[PDB]
Amino acid sequence: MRECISIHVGQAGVQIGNACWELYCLEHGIQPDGQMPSDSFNTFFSETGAGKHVPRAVFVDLEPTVIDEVRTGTYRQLFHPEQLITGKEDAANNYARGHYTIGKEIIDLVLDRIRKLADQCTGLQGFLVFHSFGGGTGSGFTSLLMERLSVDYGKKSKLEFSIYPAPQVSTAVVEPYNSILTTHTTLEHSDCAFMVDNEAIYDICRRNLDIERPTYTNLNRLISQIVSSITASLRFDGALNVDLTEFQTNLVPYPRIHFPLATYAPVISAEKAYHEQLSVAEITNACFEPANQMVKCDPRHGKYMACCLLYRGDVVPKDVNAAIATIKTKRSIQFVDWCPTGFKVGINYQPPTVVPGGDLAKVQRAVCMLSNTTAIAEAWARLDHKFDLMYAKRAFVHWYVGEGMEEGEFSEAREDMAALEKDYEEVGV
Ligand SMILES: Nc1nc2c(ncn2[C@@H]2O[C@H](COP(=O)(O)OP(=O)(O)OP(=O)(O)O)[C@@H](O)[C@H]2O)c(=O)[nH]1
Ligand SMILES: [Mg+2]
């Protein structure tokens, strides 16, 4: 058994962290008090003499209001007080403030509390980092944390769960700056990053769940399902993606191109009284629909470098192969010339767990497709354009420079993103 430490940074990371661990507890049969009347799950949960199952997680925010909801919440007994770290004042949507100014005053405390968790590990695999691109803390502090983690734990793999900003879901005007700034700094320290576009989850919640104006709870519960499908292989016995290393090996050919696209199916409204259960072929076909992707883009106009299929539920290997073989002769799936046109398949026999009273209906079978497509570069292009619009006038720059950051960092970060777009283009045809 090899352990995994989850790190939740800023409001987005913390709130999503809440949704994930709520789900993890439901899947493993762990009550909020920590007791488990019923190993692979020990990778995410430590055990006390009392039989309490404690999440191997760290919550960090530069202001206390978000984490305070955890300290007083349903799962207040689940986490050790040390795991919940809060500062006085936040980064004010300022990357520089979160990274340089405030980050310096709390980084040592965070690393020390993380060290506590690392000493409880017989063989730490690495870290799972949850954060937003837009927040001053989510962008600024995360990148600093990732840098220090690479120093203190060089040999440990680091995975990211990033929240891509969207105007439909409460963004600030400066969030394109923070997104580029954090991607640049974190790029060399992240082995594999799963971007989650708030616009895509917003639309999935409106389309499939019939929620006119989705809340953070609606969004996070949907995100948690995807995150759970990604980490299920680490928490259950699963011959595929058994360790953090396999994620890079199976999905990341080139170090810089470490942004796999996630696609989930099926998403059924719980209010839908009458619904027939979808077959293995039907949910597999839904993996190739842009509407079911976590990031808004067109894989039809890109090339695949890797593809992995993560099934959960009543899924027989026979039906999976029959579906894959059929899909290849009907769909337009273009792989890169230098890569094997194939699929890595993983099956978890326990069906997806859903939050009681949630918006998501219980299904017999579901699948999460992780595909490294050059089409995800569309998200970088959209983000880089917004950066260019503001940076051309040097709008809002004075705020970052005021925090100790140099003007050069902006251009340095943008040039790195420009190189990243070029890399995706070269890798196509
Ligand atoms: N999906 C999702 N996105 C969130 C959530 N909370 C915040 N966000 C997004 O995060 C971005 C703002 O960053 P925050 O995480 O709130 O800020 P922060 O990381 O706390 O940093 P500060 O600026 O110091 O408060 C916006 O684009 C929000 O849409 C959440 O619970 N779920
Ligand atoms: Mg905040």
Numbering used by the authors: 1 to 38, 47 to 437
What did the paper state?
Kinesins are microtubule-associated motor proteins that produce a mechanical work associated with ATP hydrolysis. We report here the crystal structure of a monomeric functional construct of the human kinesin-13 Kif2C, also named MCAK, in complex with tubulin. The Kif2C construct comprised the motor domain and the C-terminal part of the neck region and has been called “short neck+motor” (Kif2C-(sN+M))5. For crystallization purpose, Kif2C-(sN+M) was fused to a designed ankyrin repeat protein (DARPin)20 that binds tubulin and prevents its self-assembly.
We have determined the structure of a functional construct of Kif2C in an ATP-like state and bound to tubulin. In particular, Kif2C binds at the αβ interface of a curved tubulin heterodimer. Our data underscore a major structural rearrangement of the tubulin-binding subdomain of Kif2C, and of the α4-L12-α5 region in particular. The large movement of the α4 and α5 helices upon tubulin binding, with a ~25° rotation to adopt a conformation similar to that in tubulin-bound kinesin-1, led also to the reorganization of the α5/β5a–β5b interaction. The movement and lengthening of α4 led several conserved kinesin-13 residues to point toward tubulin, bringing in particular Arg510 in the vicinity of Glu113 of the tubulin α subunit, Lys524 in that of α-tubulin Glu414 and Glu415, and Glu525 in the vicinity of Arg402 from the same tubulin subunit. Upon tubulin binding, as in the case of motile kinesins, the Kif2C L11 loop became fully ordered. In agreement with previous studies, in the tubulin–Kif2C–DARPin structure, the Kif2C KVD motif at the tip of the L2 hairpin interacts with the distal end of the tubulin α subunit, corresponding to the inter-tubulin longitudinal interface of a protofilament. The contribution of the L2 loop leads Kif2C to bury a larger surface with the α subunit (about 1000 Å2) than with β-tubulin (about 720 Å2), different from kinesin-1 in which the buried surface is more evenly distributed between the two tubulin subunits. In the crystal structure, the neck helix pointed toward the solvent and interacted neither with the Kif2C motor domain nor with tubulin. Whereas the neck helix orientation we found has not been observed previously in structures of isolated kinesin-13s, this orientation likely results from a helix swapping mechanism stabilized in the crystal.
